[PDB]
Design a protein around this nucleic acid. Structure first.
Lengths: 107, 336, 336, 108, 107
DNA sequence: TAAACTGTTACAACCAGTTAAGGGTTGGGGGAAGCACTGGGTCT
RNA sequence: AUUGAAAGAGUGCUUCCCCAAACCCUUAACUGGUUGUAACAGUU
């Protein structure tokens, strides 16, 4: 549902071509054992977003798509509602799992 | 003799006993689930910790370090010199000795008498099937329960990156075709008010498990195989091996990390006879529980001495005050 | 005589009783299915568990440890000093004696008089077929149902890698082609508010099961084939064996886990006659059930004595609030 | 529907020979996971150890290790989230663990 | 069908030439009232399979080979529709039976 | 008496190297595997 | 109400008891997010 868009952008960080890798942020947002470092890594990805946009519009690829704001606030409401570490860890891992998938971004 | 030393230490930026990257640069450290109340039910939370295998191996390291100085340290495994934790890991036949001889895995009592490395930490020779339960049952390293309750967060783990920069004979960082050696990795460093409880059953060190006693005329003495002087020296060295533990010579990444340590509250019990083990430092009423068990054991009757590090504990207790750890073990070994 | 103990104990960071999953390196802790309603019907959930066989072994260990100090500790199995619970294994028509001899199997009374291990913890000799049910009953150490309610799972388990590092004599780690022993075995460590309960029927020690009563004049009289002093010493040693069972000595892999193993709450009842067994600590709420059981047993005409710790047990139930398990065993042995 | 073959391919590539990188800890984590969180962490770690496989395949001339399709991840998320029963969750995790060991078309 | 190869590669655990004798795995596979536990048993078999291959290549006997993927596909597509426990028990017992057979391991 | 114009949002290398993923040891011992109760013929 | 009327394979039995997947086993070790870059130019 609301994991495709943000997961798509997460896979935009590391994929075919795109000669700039950032796995520390993915690892941080995956194993978010505490309430935070999750939004921290997501914000770090959003900060590299202009870098990805420039690289795409320059080298070989169509411009990347930023996750929709409704998706971001849906994620924020989901992480606010959960209290136990189980749901938080499950959400974090499901969020960061899409970063490694076969996406045909650059033709 | 049986000695049980428990207490609390403070850790800051330690990567001790990592789980390992497993191909990933984010080096996982060991985590453990712990129960806390937080006034809404004792839920389980994942907290950094290190295993008792860490403390056992570092006690072995202190063991071999102290036997490197004692005059009776000649009878030691050549593997034990290099801090090698393996003790008969592979199904070998003749074990190499640092002295220049060999040990055959037959007549376990002979190995106990001759070899000193596999006397307190045990051995699991797999070919001949000769096993021996160890006498250092090291505990885990977990924080204070009220600490986690009152923080309700603030993950005790932080991720820090590092890089192995390449410079070559031409002064460059090789990308793919002139040397791909430049490397990065993210390491996890932890903190917190941790606790430990090292139990040490030195009372039967040097006594083979097969025939601990003989009872030739119904007498209460163990079946000793070595001279008492060497046994006492081994006991003293094993107990002094706890000195580097409570100062910062435990855990993994000891070179790069070297965790910071402190002495905040230590309770130690020491006796020749069998005594109950204290509680691993995790809770708030551990001091009260230790005081209760000590007073009750004294009511039963035991030649047990108690050493306390500036802790309130309670009244009507003859426990002796201590100021550090090496003087503590010196007071423990003050009698022969 | 007959004493039933139960209660709730908080555990953390323990790999106690790990099966190993066969010959693979991934050592997994014992897990058993339990029923928890979670307000949606008594659903079955797999939770870490501790076998009562391990409790029997550790009670054997404590019994032999506390019988060593007794002046009449000679009458013990040779394997008792070995800390080996194997009594009359495959193809064993005789009994190993700690004095260095053998015992012929002719009568159960002779077996229990010469060997207290078969008397207390039972024995089974296939060659002769002689049977004796143990006087020690052990239940699985299971987490509290209310604990499962308040944690809703979270797998209660952490997985830790334990790479065994080996260094050759030259100084090379090796690739298994030089005889080195490098290995990755992973272990599972659990936690939670476990529930414990042990029944100790110390009414047949020195009394063979073939003819427990002689009926000299149509009156009840135990067939104590041993001297009363030896029977009293066995009572005291078996009752004091509970001290390591509750302080720090339980489970497997104690050398590398050694959990906190503190008593959160405890109840125990003792009597000279048959008594109902205590309810386990697994259930979410058993304090009221225990209160009702004790009050109804007292009203029935049972002269039982109840010792509690961290449990109020109501008001009209009389019970001495002990401060630790050692005080409990002191009260258990105070009446002889 | 579709996730079976691709998950088997990727897990085999992670576990199969001609790689000298035999990661069984991830397989054990995927297998022994009563709750869904640890199964998700295991599969995430398996997916994360993709660049090593790609680099090794390029270095030694092996065919590139195919990455599971996004629809496979979709189906994984749906069946993990929609099945709160630990029984079916364990069944799926053990099926993935079984597919971790398969003798597919390896390097020629 | 697809029983010959799985039985051959499962019989290696209990075979005499391999001195590990994983009787427990075959015991768990044999009498399995539910699909998940027999799946766990065959997973343990596949997990011990690399150890058998290593010991075979160390001794000199031909190394065992991993079961063909089509066998796993057939097992997966047959295990789903085990609505009645009887067919599941039949499959588990058949696998256990084919785990006890003579094979040409060391010529 | 006026209220920042603008180029710029890090590049680049790299994203675990290796070593082993149980070693060993044992795979039910040992007893029994119905105890009677109910008899069907052929003769006197 | 019938080759059917009356009709106990039935009555007691702890597959039992004893038994630590147990024991030894530092993803460990070495490895700097490193290096260069004026918030700068100019302003009554």
């Amino acid at each position: 549902g609301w994991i495709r868009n943000i997961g798509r952008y997460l896979s935009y960080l590391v994929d075919d071509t795109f000669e700039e890798y950032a796995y520390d942020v993915v690892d941080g947002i995956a194993k978010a054992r505490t309430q935070e470092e999750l939004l921290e890594g997501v914000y770090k990805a959003l900060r590299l977003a202009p870098k990805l946009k420039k690289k795409a519009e320059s080298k070989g690829c169509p411009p990347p798509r930023i996750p929709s704001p409704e998706d971001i606030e849906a994620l924020e409401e989901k992480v606010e509602q959960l209290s136990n570490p189980k749901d938080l860890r499950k959400l974090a891992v499901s969020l960061a799992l899409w970063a490694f998938a076969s996406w045909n971004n650059c033709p | 003799m049986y000695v049980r030393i428990s207490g609390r230490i403070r850790l800051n930026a330690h990567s001790l006993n990592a789980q390992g990257g497993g191909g990933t640069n984010y080096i996982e450290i060991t985590k453990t689930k712990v129960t806390v109340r937080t006034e809404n039910g004792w839920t389980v939370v994942e907290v950094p910790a290190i295993t008792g295998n860490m403390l056992k191996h570092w006690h072995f390291v202190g063991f071999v370090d102290y036997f490197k100085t004692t005059p009776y340290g000649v009878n030691l495994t050549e593997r034990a010199l290099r801090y090698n934790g393996t003790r008969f890991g592979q199904g070998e036949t003749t074990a190499t000795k640092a002295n220049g001889a060999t040990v055959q895995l037959n007549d376990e009592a002979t190995i106990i008498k001759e070899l000193a490395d596999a006397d307190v930490h045990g051995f699991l020779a797999p070919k001949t099937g000769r096993r021996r339960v160890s006498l250092v049952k090291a505990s885990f390293i977990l924080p204070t329960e009220d600490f986690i309750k009152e923080v309700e967060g603030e993950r005790l783990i932080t991720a820090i990156k590092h890089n192995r920069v390449d410079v070559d004979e031409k002064g460059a960082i090789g990308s793919s075709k002139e040397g791909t050696a430049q490397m990065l990795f993210s390491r996890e460093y932890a903190t917190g008010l941790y606790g430990f409880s090292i139990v040490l059953d030195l009372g039967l060190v040097g006594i083979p498990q097969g025939l601990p006693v003989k009872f030739e005329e119904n007498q209460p003495r163990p079946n000793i195989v070595i001279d008492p002087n060497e046994r006492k020296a081994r006991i003293e060295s094993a107990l002094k091996a706890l000195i580097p533990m409570l100062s910062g010579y435990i855990g993994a990444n000891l070179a790069r990390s070297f965790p910071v340590f402190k002495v905040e509250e230590l309770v130690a019990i020491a006796s020749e006879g069998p005594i109950p083990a204290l509680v691993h430092g995790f809770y708030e009423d551990y001091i009260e529980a230790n005081r209760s068990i000590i007073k009750n054991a004294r009511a039963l009757g035991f030649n047990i001495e108690v050493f306390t590090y500036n802790v309130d504990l309670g009244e009507d207790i003859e426990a002796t005050k201590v100021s550090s750890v090496e003087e503590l073990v010196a007071n423990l070994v003050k009698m022969v």
